[PDB]
Design a protein around this nucleic acid. Structure first.
Lengths: 89, 201, 136, 163, 83, 131
RNA sequence: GGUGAGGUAACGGCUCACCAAGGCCACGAUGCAUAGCCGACCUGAGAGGGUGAUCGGCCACACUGGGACUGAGACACGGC
RNA sequence: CAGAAAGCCACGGCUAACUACGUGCCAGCAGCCGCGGUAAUACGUAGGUGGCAAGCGUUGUCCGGAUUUAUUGGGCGUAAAGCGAGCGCAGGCGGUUUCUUAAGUCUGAUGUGAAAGCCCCCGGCUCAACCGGGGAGGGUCAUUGGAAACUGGGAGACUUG
């Protein structure tokens, strides 16, 4: 039940967010296995700061990227590349 | 307590004119108190380094703990003397760019100017008086309402203008030219009475 | 000493006392408990009142306050200030400090933070004796 | 040796005592003084004397002091290496510092080493703290110091294969 | 299979038990504060087939699995015999 | 009973030097011969020579002195005495009097100076200082 | 410790029956008192002393003590 | 519109800061030395000055200064400190030398020592803290290969102990 997800680093008013990749038994900002990506919550068009190297390696193992990961990596087409290089493979 | 002094009694007590021979000389060399002339025995080196550090602290009006942390920034460099590189890094406050360019006449005028957003740098506003100005930031004067007379009143009163910055009063534009050094930027104050006081404070 | 003789002994330290014994409170209630209570200050009550004259060769009549805390032990403590606002059988806070006037006393009671008042002469040391800013 | 009294020198008076000797009836009181004299270029000395008042005492001390001066072999306004000197309870540690850091030393040993023209040095008082034996052990430790051309000259080899 | 057990070439001390001897290894290490080399040892309960090695014999030993109330050693090679 | 003859050799050096005469005879072994050749290398002994009949050694030490009768060597003491052997790695190599003296390291190939150890990145056990 | 059997996701005195008396200790067994352990810290020139909050990891506990059941996973914090 | 935006404890030495008067063995100050007692920079007022600085005094606790537990880094004739003396089990340390060994020791390669931590390089928040990217630190660690001087294990030798 491995699962890639997000992680907050806020202050009071202005947050900063990070993608994080883990197993779903764990808490969100708690433990994990390794690291994937981040993104700016402010200044749209914000800073799409992605690894885009471990998502397809990680879903080769088989996981479930969450709701935000699918949209903001379909902006980079990684989920499009997921069913483009895995349903075609 | 941030700044109160009328630039009379501090220049009286420490002794050096603070700092460009802009004096008030009818009452200077005798210190205040109920014994003006009727002085007493010699000064301990406690009091010597005391008034010495208070002389360099009143080069700005700044804070003792900020002087501490800026002194600790001067040890990261690992070239040259630690007092000399502190003395150089003493002179890259935004207010130091204000005074040594020729846009004002004193540091309190520098801080009262830069308090209310009256200057910018490189087409971007800086609010704080203590920004770290490197070499390359072409300092500006916020050309919205620069017809205010006291800017050019301080410019055209060409009293104290050093010769290590390249600057033209035509555009009111210029940049901090290159590196200063000890032998050029204000003798005579210190090379070691800082680096000895700050071990056993 | 030689080094294996330093191996088979541990070189113990010089374990220190502290001249504030009453600020480490091995309670009575309920089950006569222990101390975890490294305090700045402890509040207590009165048991008697009086004065004291010191050793040779100092000569006056200093006053004091003997205090029982909640741990059923009694210490004599000193009074600061001019005008003792406290009286017999009254709640009293303590502050720690050794005093070289007499054997026995090693504390001084508070002025101007609790049940006691403070100063009405000093307009220059107003943080001490717990009576700050008067408009006069 | 006799370093002459023909150099520009500078003084600093370290400390004075008031010292008795009982006579039948009253009490004598005389002062001593412990004065160092230096060129702040690399020649320093010390001395003492007693009299009945302060300026006469320090005059006699400066009179004594210029008979004795020491070489203090410098390199870059810093010691060549680490030297420890001891004279009757006066253990003094002295150690070369980083160039531009200053003198990190106490009361009397600063009054020697600043006056002898040392920019950068570290020290630590250890043992006795009367101001006489401090100064004497200081000057004894500064005596105990070598130099590269000296050492390579003493051995049959040359310098710059050992620096 | 990629790893054997760390064999500890101890000597035999006790052999009074059936199928079971006592192997004592010895090593020497430092002091956590001072410097010189100490001397210390443990004792290893070793399982034999029929108690071959005598008192003082040298044998290397190898662990298998918990056989008893935590004895975890086997015989390998009778290296050299006392007499 | 002597349980360490190297320190006796070093103290006979200091005892003959402290009263300043240059004749010295100690019974010697292989390693005393090694430190004799090291001290003849770096300019401290005027001559060494060997006389053997049926027993220990001996190596005869001829001390070195200057123009105005002073001494070129001024002290001598060991480091890894018996009782506490002390070992030094290649980034632990000492540098005595800022390299104005020398120090002895026994590496895996002989007795060398401590410039030789940082000239090969090879450490060992430190016998003694001298300066 | 050995013998065999039961039992266990799993080895094993974990448990039963038989044969012996073996085991651990001055390098500190056993006993008594105090303490949750760690990554870490506004101390020191450094060797080393002091604290175990944040925040993160592991372990243990649910008014006190026993006991199981469902469920693969609990002897279960808002289950019995 | 300069308008709303100024507060803290002492001044006998250690440790910058003086006067007038009162109580004048007593009212009360003491971090320690130490004051008082009719001429107090020490008791108390009042003004003068001093150092931090919208934060500044007191109290408690922890490390230093402490070489005052000394491995780094102390010593036992008189200062605190060699058992009243011998004999010896275990234990600590051992004369010279040839060959071997490689346990200690030195050296390479590899896996690991979570992330945020501290530091350094680079960057953004108007700088600043806060956040981001990259490696050094934490092994007295595990496997694997050499080195054979010193210590340790095996075989022989010598005569000084």
């Amino acid at each position: 039940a491995v699962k890639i997800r997000l992680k907050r680093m806020g202050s009071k008013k202005s947050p900063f967010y990070r993608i994080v990749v883990a197993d779903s038994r764990s808490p969100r900002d708690g433990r994990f296995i390794e690291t994937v990506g981040t993104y700016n919550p402010l200044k749209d068009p914000a800073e799409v700061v992605l690894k885009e190297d471990l998502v397809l390696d990680w879903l080769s193992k088989g996981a479930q990227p969450s709701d935000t990961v699918r949209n903001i990596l379909s902006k980079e087409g990684v989920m499009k590349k997921h069913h483009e290089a895995k349903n075609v493979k | 307590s941030r700044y109160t002094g009328p630039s009379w009694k501090v220049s009286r007590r420490l002794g050096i004119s603070l700092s460009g021979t802009g004096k008030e000389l009818a009452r200077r060399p005798y210190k205040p108190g109920q014994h003006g002339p009727n002085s007493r025995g010699k000064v301990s080196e406690y009091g010597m380094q005391l008034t010495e550090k208070q002389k360099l602290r009143h080069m700005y009006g700044m804070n003792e703990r900020q002087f501490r942390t800026l002194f600790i920034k001067a040890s990261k460099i690992k070239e040259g003397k630690h007092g000399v590189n502190f003395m150089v890094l003493l002179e890259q406050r935004l207010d130091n760019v204000v005074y040594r360019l020729g846009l004002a006449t004193t540091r309190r005028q520098a801080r009262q100017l830069v308090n209310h957003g009256h200057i910018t740098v490189d087409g971007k506003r800086v609010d704080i008086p203590s920004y770290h100005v490197e070499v390359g930031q072409v300092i500006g004067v916020r050309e919205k309402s620069q017809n205010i007379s006291t800017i050019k009143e301080a410019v055209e009163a060409t009293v104290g203008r050093p010769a290590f910055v390249s600057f033209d009063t035509e555009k009111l534009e210029g940049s901090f030219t290159r590196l200063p050094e000890r032998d050029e930027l204000y003798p005579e104050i210190d090379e070691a009475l800082v680096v000895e006081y700050y071990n056993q404070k | 000493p030689t080094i294996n003789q330093l191996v088979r002994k541990p070189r113990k330290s010089k374990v220190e006392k502290s001249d504030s014994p009453a600020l480490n409170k091995g309670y009575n209630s309920f089950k006569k408990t222990q101390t975890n209570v490294n305090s700045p200050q402890k509040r207590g009550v009165c048991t008697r009142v009086g004065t004291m004259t010191p050793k040779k060769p100092n000569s006056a009549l200093r006053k004091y306050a003997r205090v029982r805390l909640s741990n059923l032990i009694e210490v004599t403590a000193y009074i600061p200030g001019i005008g003792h606002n406290l009286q017999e059988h009254s709640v009293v806070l303590l502050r720690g400090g050794r005093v070289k006037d007499l054997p026995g006393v090693r504390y001084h009671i508070v002025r101007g933070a609790l049940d006691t008042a403070g100063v009405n002469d000093r307009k220059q040391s107003r943080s001490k004796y717990g009576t700050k800013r008067p408009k006069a | 040796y006799i370093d002459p009294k023909h150099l520009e020198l500078e003084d600093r008076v370290v400390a004075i005592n008031r010292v008795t000797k009982v006579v039948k009836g009253g009490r004598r009181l005389r002062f001593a003084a412990l004065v160092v004299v230096g060129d702040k270029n690399g020649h320093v000395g010390f001395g003492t004397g007693k009299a009945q008042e302060v300026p006469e005492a320090i005059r006699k001390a400066i009179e004594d002091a210029k008979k004795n001066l020491v070489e203090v072999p410098m390199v870059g306004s810093t010691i060549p290496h680490e030297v420890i000197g001891v004279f009757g309870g006066g253990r003094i540690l002295m150690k070369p510092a980083v160039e531009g850091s200053g003198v990190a030393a106490g009361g009397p040993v600063r009054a020697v080493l600043e006056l002898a023209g040392v920019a950068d040095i570290t020290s630590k008082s250890l043992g006795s703290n009367t101001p006489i034996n401090v100064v004497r052990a200081t000057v004894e430790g500064l005596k105990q110091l070598k130099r590269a051309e000296e050492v390579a000259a003493l051995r049959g080899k040359s310098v710059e294969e050992i620096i | 299979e990629r790893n054997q057990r760390k064999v500890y070439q101890g000597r035999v001390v006790s052999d009074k038990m059936d199928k079971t001897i006592t192997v004592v290894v010895e090593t020497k290490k430092n002091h956590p504060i001072y410097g010189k080399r100490m001397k210390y040892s443990k004792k290893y309960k070793a399982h034999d087939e029929n108690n071959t090695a005598k008192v003082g014999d040298i044998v290397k030993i190898m662990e298998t699995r918990p056989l008893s109330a935590t004895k975890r050693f086997r015989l390998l090679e009778v290296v050299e015999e006392a007499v | 009973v002597m349980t360490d003859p190297i320190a006796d050799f070093l103290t006979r050096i200091r005892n003959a030097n402290m009263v300043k005469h240059e004749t010295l005879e100690v019974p010697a072994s292989k390693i005393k011969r090694d430190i004799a050749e090291i001290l003849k290398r770096e300019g401290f002994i005027r001559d060494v020579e060997y006389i053997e009949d049926d027993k220990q050694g001996v190596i005869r030490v001829f001390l070195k002195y200057g123009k105005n009768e002073e001494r070129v060597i001024t002290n001598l003491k060991r480091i890894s005495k018996p009782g506490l052997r002390a070992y030094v790695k290649a980034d632990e190599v000492p540098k005595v009097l800022n390299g104005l003296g020398i120090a002895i390291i026994s590496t895996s190939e002989g007795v060398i100076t401590d410039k030789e150890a940082r000239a090969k990145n090879i450490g060992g056990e430190v016998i003694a200082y001298v300066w």
